[PDB]
Design an enzyme around this catalytic site. Structure first.
Site, PDB file in Angstrom:
ATOM      1  N   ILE A  11       0.806  -1.231   0.000  1.00  0.00           N
ATOM      2  CA  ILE A  11       0.000   0.000   0.000  1.00  0.00           C
ATOM      3  C   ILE A  11       0.844   1.288   0.000  1.00  0.00           C
ATOM      4  O   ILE A  11       0.300   2.389   0.203  1.00  0.00           O
ATOM      5  CB  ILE A  11      -1.011   0.041   1.194  1.00  0.00           C
ATOM      6  CG1 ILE A  11      -0.308   0.286   2.532  1.00  0.00           C
ATOM      7  CG2 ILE A  11      -1.791  -1.254   1.258  1.00  0.00           C
ATOM      8  CD1 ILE A  11      -1.200   0.009   3.781  1.00  0.00           C
ATOM      9  N   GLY A  12       2.158   1.168  -0.216  1.00  0.00           N
ATOM     10  CA  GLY A  12       3.044   2.350  -0.209  1.00  0.00           C
ATOM     11  C   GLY A  12       4.522   2.020  -0.305  1.00  0.00           C
ATOM     12  O   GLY A  12       4.897   0.846  -0.398  1.00  0.00           O
ATOM     13  N   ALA A  13      11.398   2.494   1.572  1.00  0.00           N
ATOM     14  CA  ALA A  13      10.624   1.529   2.366  1.00  0.00           C
ATOM     15  C   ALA A  13       9.205   1.260   1.833  1.00  0.00           C
ATOM     16  O   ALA A  13       8.397   2.185   1.623  1.00  0.00           O
ATOM     17  CB  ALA A  13      10.555   1.964   3.830  1.00  0.00           C
ATOM     18  N   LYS A  14       8.932  -0.034   1.632  1.00  0.00           N
ATOM     19  CA  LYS A  14       7.602  -0.537   1.285  1.00  0.00           C
ATOM     20  C   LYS A  14       6.697  -0.542   2.533  1.00  0.00           C
ATOM     21  O   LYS A  14       7.157  -0.859   3.622  1.00  0.00           O
ATOM     22  CB  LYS A  14       7.722  -1.972   0.719  1.00  0.00           C
ATOM     23  CG  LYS A  14       8.541  -2.096  -0.580  1.00  0.00           C
ATOM     24  CD  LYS A  14       9.469  -3.335  -0.600  1.00  0.00           C
ATOM     25  CE  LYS A  14       8.702  -4.667  -0.463  1.00  0.00           C
ATOM     26  NZ  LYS A  14       9.479  -5.832  -0.998  1.00  0.00           N
ATOM     27  N   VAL A  15       5.433  -0.173   2.366  1.00  0.00           N
ATOM     28  CA  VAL A  15       4.409  -0.353   3.393  1.00  0.00           C
ATOM     29  C   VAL A  15       3.458  -1.440   2.902  1.00  0.00           C
ATOM     30  O   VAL A  15       2.962  -1.389   1.776  1.00  0.00           O
ATOM     31  CB  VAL A  15       3.602   0.924   3.694  1.00  0.00           C
ATOM     32  CG1 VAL A  15       2.768   0.719   4.952  1.00  0.00           C
ATOM     33  CG2 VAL A  15       4.498   2.120   3.869  1.00  0.00           C
ATOM     34  N   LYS A  30       5.482  -1.034   7.995  1.00  0.00           N
ATOM     35  CA  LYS A  30       6.562  -0.366   7.284  1.00  0.00           C
ATOM     36  C   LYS A  30       7.786  -1.294   7.303  1.00  0.00           C
ATOM     37  O   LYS A  30       8.194  -1.754   8.364  1.00  0.00           O
ATOM     38  CB  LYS A  30       6.834   0.980   7.945  1.00  0.00           C
ATOM     39  CG  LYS A  30       7.543   1.995   7.073  1.00  0.00           C
ATOM     40  CD  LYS A  30       7.544   3.388   7.722  1.00  0.00           C
ATOM     41  CE  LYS A  30       8.428   4.402   6.942  1.00  0.00           C
ATOM     42  NZ  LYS A  30       8.943   5.515   7.820  1.00  0.00           N
ATOM     43  N   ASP A 123       6.852  18.435   9.590  1.00  0.00           N
ATOM     44  CA  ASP A 123       6.390  18.194   8.206  1.00  0.00           C
ATOM     45  C   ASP A 123       4.870  18.065   8.089  1.00  0.00           C
ATOM     46  O   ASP A 123       4.335  17.198   7.383  1.00  0.00           O
ATOM     47  CB  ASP A 123       7.038  16.985   7.560  1.00  0.00           C
ATOM     48  CG  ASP A 123       6.923  17.018   6.042  1.00  0.00           C
ATOM     49  OD1 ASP A 123       6.851  18.151   5.448  1.00  0.00           O
ATOM     50  OD2 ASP A 123       6.899  15.919   5.445  1.00  0.00           O
TER      51      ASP A 123
END
Lengths: 311, 14
Positions: A11-12, A13-15, A30, A123
């Site tokens: 869904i997203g 380092a890979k997530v 993560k 951020d």
């Protein structure tokens, strides 16, 4: 598959979305390659983890578990299935002031609570405001965060340009909380308009505009929202409103006559809940190791199971 | 201005 987690889709380092095998709960994991980090990076990664462990607020992405191997660090996080506020804004254009206020009360509570814990985020931006399944805000990405003290201006000028306080574009040692107050003003603007107050063809344009500190107020914006923006978006940092001041502002509390926004009070720990403890005992854990894990705030497999049973 | 993603930056003074 990793520890007590079955890894599922990226869904997203890979997530990766995962399921906790013992509790059946969905989480976001993560996966971070340590090998290819440098000392500086490694150091900031330990700092980020230490910071995440300290924060316990309903509108901040919760850390459940830290798993370490020689080559990989796994951070097991609360999963926010609604995605980023950024992509929500692109899909819906903007938020009406009532919806913006619902999000912004949760945002402000969360950030003011970071500040209570002596953490600056650094951020804050639409991409870092996530939405869970019930459309509640979950603040993410503490990669630029640091601890602060009032006896110490901060030194490192990190942020994202359209959200960055002008003192950061300058060389100027700064009071940390005040930097997050500016970014919050930019967020407020973007939730109610769907647009950014400061940008340009290039970053030299963006910079100039941020430093002038002039932004356009669209005609549909209420007088209260305009006046609130003026307390965030002030060039001189020492006269930007405090977040405690800002909580009492009229815009923040429209429809909340009986429930003014006030600083979050962190709940007392409950490490000895009979229901969760019993369940875990019949999974084969003992009370002794639940106590040690929780009291030691170890974020190991035991602690993670206890937390996931209450979620 | 149009809502768009920008890169994070470690040192905005440049």
């Amino acid at each position: 598959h990793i520890g007590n987690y079955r890894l599922l889709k990226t869904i997203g380092a890979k997530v990766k979305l995962a399921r906790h095998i013992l509790t059946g709960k969905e989480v976001a994991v993560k996966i971070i390659d340590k090998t290819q980090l440098n000392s500086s990076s490694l150091q900031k990664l330990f700092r980020e983890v230490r910071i995440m462990k300290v924060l316990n607020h309903p509108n901040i992405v919760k850390l459940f578990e830290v798993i370490e191997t020689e080559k990989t660090l796994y951070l097991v996080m609360e999963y926010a299935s609604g995605g980023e506020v950024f992509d929500y804004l692109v899909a819906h254009g903007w938020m009406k002031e009532k919806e913006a206020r619902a999000k912004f009360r949760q945002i402000v509570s969360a950030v003011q609570y970071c500040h209570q814990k002596f953490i600056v985020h650094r951020d804050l931006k639409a991409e870092n405001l996530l939405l869970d399944a019930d459309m509640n805000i979950k603040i993410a990405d503490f990669g630029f965060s640091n601890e602060f003290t009032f006896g110490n201006k901060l030194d490192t000028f990190c942020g994202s340009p359209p959200y960055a306080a002008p003192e950061l574009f300058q060389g100027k040692k700064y009071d940390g909380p005040e930097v997050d107050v500016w970014s919050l003003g930019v967020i407020l603007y973007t939730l109610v308009s769907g647009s950014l107050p400061f940008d340009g063809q290039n970053l030299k344009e963006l910079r100039e505009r941020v430093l002038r500190g002039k932004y356009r107020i669209p005609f549909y914006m209420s007088t209260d929202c305009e006046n609130l923006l003026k307390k965030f978006l002030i060039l001189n940092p020492s006269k930007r409103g405090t977040l405690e001041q800002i909580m009492k502002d009229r815009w923040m509390n429209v429809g909340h006559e009986d429930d003014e926004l006030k600083p979050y009070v962190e709940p007392l720990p409950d490490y000895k809940d009979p229901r969760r403890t019993e369940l875990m005992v019949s999974m084969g854990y003992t009370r002794e190791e639940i106590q040690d894990s929780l009291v030691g705030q170890r974020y190991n497999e035991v602690m993670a199971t206890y937390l996931l049973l209450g979620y | 201005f149009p809502l768009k993603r920008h890169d994070k930056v470690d040192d905005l003074s440049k």
